Design a protein around this ligand. Structure first.
Ligand SMILES: [Cl-]
Lengths: 495, 493
């Protein structure tokens, strides 16, 4: 078909930029480049902040990725933001309705809940039961005239199996019964993931998509949508799931999953991408150190993994060390200084330590922790006269979660959040904060910890509170599940 | 009245001393409070080039400055005693022609048995005057024979000397206590007493502020002025700087290096404020002030007769007060510039490169290069081959040998420390374990000898001495016998 290869990444900004987003973005960039093609970027802002787009775009630039087209560099298939394409998705959703491949569902939320509880009570599969699938087109129009709100749902074949072609794995066979009557257009007239992905991929002339294997169950729905529109479905290759060393799905409890954390901790971007390539791929000779160009030159789809690479942070650090030693001394110096040369950060640090230093040589002692990764702490450091080991862990966990949700990482937001927590538990603040000095600075005496947390940033602050919870033994599965419920019940602490 | 001119005459003997800054501060202050000038003169009669630069830079940093000196020239140049030797030789021979001085041909061995015979016989130890009674004609004969000689001054046999001090008033010292001081040494260069009478005359010095420790020498200077017919300048003797125990200020207890305090983060304004608080106080009892404020209200009579105490912690607190007066911007820049030495940074990056895996590891491995004194304990100096006693012998000998390097280079440090290991029946690996703790504060760190070169002589010796205090120190005659051993040690460089 000699159709120009084009791939994309379609991140949905939700605060911290995830390593998985860079990992997937890496392999679409690599494949497209190895075929003489283009790699573009599309922001799928689902509104689940205004600047959260800038967060993800900056995190991918630092990581070493770049895109031919996108919301910032422009492109022929603009706009490259889902928020600015609402008219497009509604247009095509109604085209499926016209062609009989979709139908309006008028079920209310109460009716859907009842439908799900009846199925569970009968042990039946929990899925949409086709309440409005057989409604004729004229009848569907009549209810819209009465003002009945509705969604648009895709039809699904009644029997048989779906046959998907994966570039690496080959044939994929999923029974059609296991495919939901997916909601394409919501009541507010905005799309769901599946309608927007098919429409945007086709209009931007995407030819290949590489995505996590978690999306395999969705693949039949994508095939149906392309058939309904009469569009050429791009080829699909599924990447292996990122895992913790214990082989569970990657999670921020064991090790951080933020790109900007690894920047703040001292990992060169080239090393991080080097390691994420090894999470789903092996080069022709199984070389563990390589650059993006080396990976592109010899890229082979059949070398993509389905096996059991794991995300061992210690191995990532080893690899970074091999990068650091292959730099010249001058390059290393300029990298250390640049990595710590944020003028705004330095001014704040001087303001913080000015009351406590008697010599210029005291600065390194009071300000050293601002540039460490994880301070050297022990369970005994968290000794507390008023609070016991269990209560300290609860404070660290609840604070970690509440702090993770801040729309902006400001000193005042941090203060209102931890002050709100202390007030909610009727613990005087000075006792409430004793653990944070240990976790953040590594000792009981330091600069005001709330200001230190603002300076080091969200990624480092959260990495040191989670480390402290590990240092204190963590909490069991049962005791932690209850604590998570307690967290959902907390009030909003921001005025 | 003559224009007021003060000076200092420091010897470039290596590490500049805070006491030199102390005296220079009050000579400069007094001259400026009198519509006069301040002079710098280099007493480099005894032999270097680097040492002279080290001391001029040390005083400039402290904030002192001079109207004439070796660097800036002046109407009474040269301002180095090494470039004035022929001048001192002429005057010392003038006293000979006039009968106020005589040639003494005593060989060193003769002098040694002179004092030994005096001590064993219970007689005062001084010059017995055996060559004093030679006539000129007899003296010239020995010179033609090639007999080497010095020139000694004559002293009245009886009577007293009245010394007009500006603070103590009148100080009478009998002539019996004043020796026939050597004026010209055996090879033609002056001693301190001849050089300073001559230079203070030619350079038109009118007042001299000097440590009280040199008061016994004052009668000798007065005699030299009387012999030459010159107007002796007015003397004022400052109180001596003391350790916290009231003893003479000694490197052994506290650090005495001006440049050490620069390396430790002491602002020069803080150091000058503290040195100015030793002898002299300000009218409103105020303990924080500037150079000009000291000058304006300056009065000789407000100088202290008692011995001031040099508490290192009081200096650190004062610097803390100075730091807090800066804006955040000025404080930030002062910290970065204090550590911005590009050669030091390139050395540090090279040293930590084999041992870091993250950029966040830099501060953990490089933190000690910018500390003052690492936090250490006697438990940290736990050696298998050595006990607490043996390690102390190692650190003291290293400190003494490392204070005498001509040039502070890594190569010189390696040859030194390697040699001491050889003449100790100690393998080099075990010899350096204490050095890792004292310097880096940790048993694990970058190569310790390279580190000692980066941080400089001042900081390395400060941390080695601080280690000796931590282990408990070896005083009494234990340090006296060790001093003898260091003297008998061979040369390594
Ligand atoms: Cl003097």
């Amino acid at each position: 078909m000699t159709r120009p290869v084009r791939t994309r990444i379609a991140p949905s900004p939700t605060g911290f930029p995830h390593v998985g987003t860079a990992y997937i973005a890496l392999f679409n960039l690599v494949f497209a480049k190895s075929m003489g093609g283009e790699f573009i970027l599309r922001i799928e802002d689902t509104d689940q902040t205004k600047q959260s787009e800038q967060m993800i775009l900056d995190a991918l630039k630092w990581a070493g990725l770049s895109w031919a087209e996108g919301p910032d560099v422009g492109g022929p298939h603009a706009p490259y933001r889902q928020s600015e394409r609402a008219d497009i998705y509604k247009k095509y959703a109604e085209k499926l309705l016209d062609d009989g491949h979709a139908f309006r569902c008028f079920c209310t939320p109460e009716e859907l809940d009842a439908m799900r509880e009846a199925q569970m009570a009968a042990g039946l599969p929990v899925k949409y039961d086709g309440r409005y699938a057989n409604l004729s087109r004229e009848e569907s129009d009549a209810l819209v005239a009465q003002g009945k709100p509705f969604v648009i749902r895709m039809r699904v074949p009644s029997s048989g199996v779906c046959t998907i072609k994966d570039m690496l794995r080959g044939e994929v066979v999923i029974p059609w019964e296991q495919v939901d009557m997916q909601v394409l257009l919501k009541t507010d007239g905005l799309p769901t993931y599946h309608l927007a992905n098919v429409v945007d991929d086709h209009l931007m002339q995407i030819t290949h998509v590489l995505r996590g294997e978690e999306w395999l169950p969705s693949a039949p729905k994508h095939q149906l949508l392309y058939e309904y529109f009469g569009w050429q479905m791009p080829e699909l290759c599924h990447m292996p799931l990122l895992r913790n060393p214990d082989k569970s799905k990657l999670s921020k409890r064991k090790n951080p999953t933020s790109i900007t954390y690894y920047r703040d901790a001292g990992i060169l971007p080239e090393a991080l991408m080097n390691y994420l390539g090894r999470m789903g791929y092996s080069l022709p000779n199984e070389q563990e150190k390589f650059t993006l160009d080396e990976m592109i030159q010899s890229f082979d789809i059949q070398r993509i993994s389905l096996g059991g690479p794991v995300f061992d942070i210690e191995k990532l650090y080893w690899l970074n060390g091999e990068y650091l030693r292959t730099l010249s001394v001058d390059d290393l110096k300029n990298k250390i200084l640049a990595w710590a040369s944020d003028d705004t950060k330095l001014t704040a640090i001087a303001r913080a330590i000015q009351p406590r230093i008697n010599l210029l040589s005291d600065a390194i002692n009071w300000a050293g922790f601002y540039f460490q990764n994880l301070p050297a702490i022990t369970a005994e450091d968290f000794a507390h006269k008023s609070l016991d080991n269990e209560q300290i862990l609860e404070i660290l966990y609840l604070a970690t979660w509440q702090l993770e949700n801040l729309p902006i990482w400001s000193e005042e937001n941090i203060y209102q959040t931890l002050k709100g927590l202390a007030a909610h538990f009727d613990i005087k603040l000075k006792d409430f904060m004793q653990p944070f000095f240990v976790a953040i600075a590594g000792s009981t005496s330091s600069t005001p910890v709330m200001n230190s947390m603002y300076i080091i940033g969200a990624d480092m602050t959260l990495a040191r509170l989670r480390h402290a919870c590990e240092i204190l033994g963590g909490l069991g599965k049962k005791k932690l599940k209850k604590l998570e419920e307690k967290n959902k019940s907390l009030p909003n602490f921001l005025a």
